[PDB]
Symmetry: D2
């Protein structure tokens, strides 16, 4: 499923930084009960940077096993080296995932032509649908609409998670791609705006703790009921912002612990524990959203 | 050497994308002959993002073997996960390398506290000297002077490669650290200015192809002969700029090939071959520098 | 009228830089015939910076006289000194203008509190409706949604011309103001997007040469017919961009001369004549729009 | 003097917002006593935006009268319309002022060609020396080094006040102009660095309240005693920064009042009185500097 509210799920960890199966099960059951459309496993929010390839694959497989066919799983498969991305993609072929979320290479700042070649090569070596992920604030590069239009001609490149927060991108990309290419926000604070302009859903951090309100917001938006959706959005807005008061996923993991959805808020270095001021800010945002 | 003209050497490849030993040897002999102070092996210009950890270690060790004690070798050891940076650093413990160049974590955008913990943990697992590397355009995070001061208190954190191009950083950092902490430019176009303000050298892209000129410019700078150093700088300014006409190290590899220093200008995706326009721009810059 | 397509009209000049009444008459008749909602007289596009107060008032009065009640006129009344803005506003009280367009102070960078006091004072001393104008790229300051919400409580502050191009502002402001407060784009390239998110019209540069298509686009948008509006927008998009290929109003004045709407494309220094390359670019954009 | 510590003096006011002669006299005597090199009258810190042209001329002429030949006076003569800048400059022809400080046009964002024509026309209508002033944060335009080179060819264009805070500009400009062209910092926090790179002084906000320290710092810099100059700089750094805690000249006027140098800290809207938090921040900075 590549529309509506899609959660970029946390990778819950025990105190040693290893994946907590019991906590993940609780999250997945929560998303199944709450109407989330799909689960992005080991995206940014899932700490892809700090899991090695084997651990990363283990988390995706554990998420599929636990989902048990009740909700679709999309795997994070991005890398900044094209061979690495291909390799990681092969590990998931015939796994049961419905598609992959593949980020623009980070740190090395490839050209637009390099991005085209990167993603083209990855798509060539799988039959899985691929969702491109643009987030320049993290990567140092910006996959522009022109290049997205070029890539959308590749049969299995089927959408984009656009995390610039620059809402002009929605219709710049839309006019260059076919009607069935999926435009998904990757920026919760501007996501409703993104859907109002023509976007098809959101790959959401906020969905980790407000799954039902997110799912209803995105449905109302898809039906054109923007004023109604905006009422929900306004109650979620402090959380959309304050989940970034310290680096993601530090706040959202604390929030999930505070609601009882995960056993511990542990992360891997260089992510560090939430500050006391951050706990206070995040808690106030949860209360504004009606969640505590 | 953590002073003077330090080359961030290219990782020359054959047409298959693997390290070319004969080319590496030719480069290293070139830097010995030219008066280069040290070699940074598998930094950004060396394609650290697209070598696996074994391949990266092989290049470092080959470069050390080839240097044959004639020129000190600093290993690139950065990673965006602390565990991984520690693993990489441990590969070089008791190897012959003189120190490590370790970039701020990329993509995951840690806090300053996270940066402090990351570099502190890496330093604690080696006796090797550590040179911090800040390059926010590539990483999405900025290691600010205050945190550099906190880190400079750790015994074996001994300097910084400052690649913001923001020359105010030189004295901001210098006032917070001891007199023996090394300040190195990571930005060739501003590096002469950086030394004029108090910096101690440059880790240079330009030195790959103008090694003698860079070493002469840095010596003049260290001696306080800025006007003579600027004449050299002016001849190299178009190269300093045009080596980024396409993404580093696409132009510098081509330049090395054109100068006969390497056998091929091959890179690994998502870096792609230089465009025709880019060849012409770089060739004009080489001609301005009197290298061609 | 404060909705739909509102033109920020050029101030046509003869070769000596003085206002050309015959050219202005032709423009005004064109806007009356073409369905433009209103005329903003001596806005940015009308070269407010380079007319003195008397000339500025003369152009507004000439525009009212020529409009002869057939189209509403809004006067540019902004200044960077609050006393100056008050003074200029008094010159128009009982003139026949329907309202004023008042820019945030430029150059002096007042605080948000300073902006509040500025605009509050101006509104106090007139009964004319006031439209706030935010354009940070010109002014060096940014009138934020919070302050817009404060000002919208003042009875005769009735809307805003929002020229950041940052589409998140639409609903940030909307949620803080009453339903009757007018949100107008001041950025033609993002205006349709701005209306799709809840904006009520556009104060347009493009309208100077594409008045009928602009008027129909903004009507379709107001009716919710965004796909239909977007077809028009796509034909206008090169013009929305290329009217800024050199500083506004250099390109639009040339375009108006090329269509025969004004006798000369003369501007006042520091605006200078269009370059040949700029003529070529603008002409291609006019042809894409179907206007030549 | 177009070297050393040049104060951008406040225009002290009474409670009605008009120039306070007794306060101006006290300031000017203070700068004579302190070793200030020159006074810039009705620059940015002098509130040029909110004085009318007659009021502006009155302050300049009063400041010249009060200086009584003891200290050279440079008049602020910028405008964003060329005709207006020429008019203002002509007011000071054969007056006793030593030169003019003329800012790039603000708000209307001319091209570089426009900037060249603007400053060229102004220079052609006076025999007075012209100091260009670039401050893009306030004006929305950036006078680049190439254009500064073109302008430096005009006989009476003799220097630049460079207020970008981008220290690369010092040597970019210096290589394009003759050895007698003056480079002055417009950014107090970077000004010591600016002189270290080759600049010849500073047009300073800080000198309004730390005149002796600024003059001593600049003399040390001119003599090549950078380390001694930096000790002074460090004591003044919090002031250099905190004089912008609220918009300039709100903090510096309050500081002048607190030091007993002026009778009142009144400004003209849209500048507003200093907040309580701001008073406390500025007072702490004055205490760090040992001025209180
Ligand atoms: N830490 C490295 C490797 C992660 C690989 C598994 N997800 C990076 O962010 O690219
Ligand atoms: N491509 C991954 C792993 C590189 C391994 C280090 N040489 C990254 O940039 O972190
Ligand atoms: N050129 C000055 C005065 C213009 C006054 C009449 N519109 C400015 O832009 O503020
Ligand atoms: N307030 C207008 C006019 C100022 C007159 C010059 N002292 C401007 O900033 O241009
Ligand atoms: K395929
Ligand atoms: K496709
Ligand atoms: K140390
Ligand atoms: K009123
Ligand atoms: K109102
Ligand atoms: K000159």
């Amino acid at each position: 499923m590549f529309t509506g509210s899609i959660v970029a799920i946390v990778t819950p960890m025990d105190e040693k930084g290893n994946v907590c199966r019991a906590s993940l099960k609780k999250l997945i059951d929560y998303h199944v009960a709450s109407g989330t459309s799909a689960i992005v496993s080991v995206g940014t929010t899932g700490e892809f940077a700090t899991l090695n390839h084997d651990e990363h694959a283990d988390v995706v497989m554990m998420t599929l096993d636990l989902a048990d066919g009740r909700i679709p799983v999309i795997a994070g498969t991005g890398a900044n080296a094209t061979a690495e991305a291909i390799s990681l993609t092969q590990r998931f072929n015939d796994s049961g995932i419905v598609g992959c979320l593949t980020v623009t290479p980070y740190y090395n700042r490839p050209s637009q032509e390099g991005l085209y070649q990167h993603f083209k090569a990855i798509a060539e070596h799988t039959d899985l649908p691929q969702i491109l992920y643009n987030v320049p604030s993290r990567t140092g590069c910006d996959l522009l609409p022109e290049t997205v239009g070029r890539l959308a001609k590749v049969k299995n490149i089927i959408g984009i998670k656009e995390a610039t927060g620059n809402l002009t991108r929605v219709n710049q990309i839309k006019e260059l791609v076919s009607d069935d290419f999926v435009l998904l926000s990757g920026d919760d604070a501007s996501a409703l705006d993104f859907m109002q302009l023509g976007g098809h859903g959101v790959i959401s951090v906020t969905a980790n703790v407000a799954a039902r309100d997110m799912a209803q917001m995105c449905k109302l938006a898809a039906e054109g009921h923007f004023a109604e959706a905006r009422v929900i959005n306004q109650r979620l807005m402090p959380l959309h912002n304050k989940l970034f008061v310290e680096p993601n996923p530090i706040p959202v993991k604390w929030a999930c612990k505070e609601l009882g959805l995960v056993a511990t808020d542990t992360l891997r270095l260089p992510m560090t524990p939430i500050t006391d001021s951050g706990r206070e800010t995040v808690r106030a945002a949860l209360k504004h959203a009606g969640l505590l």
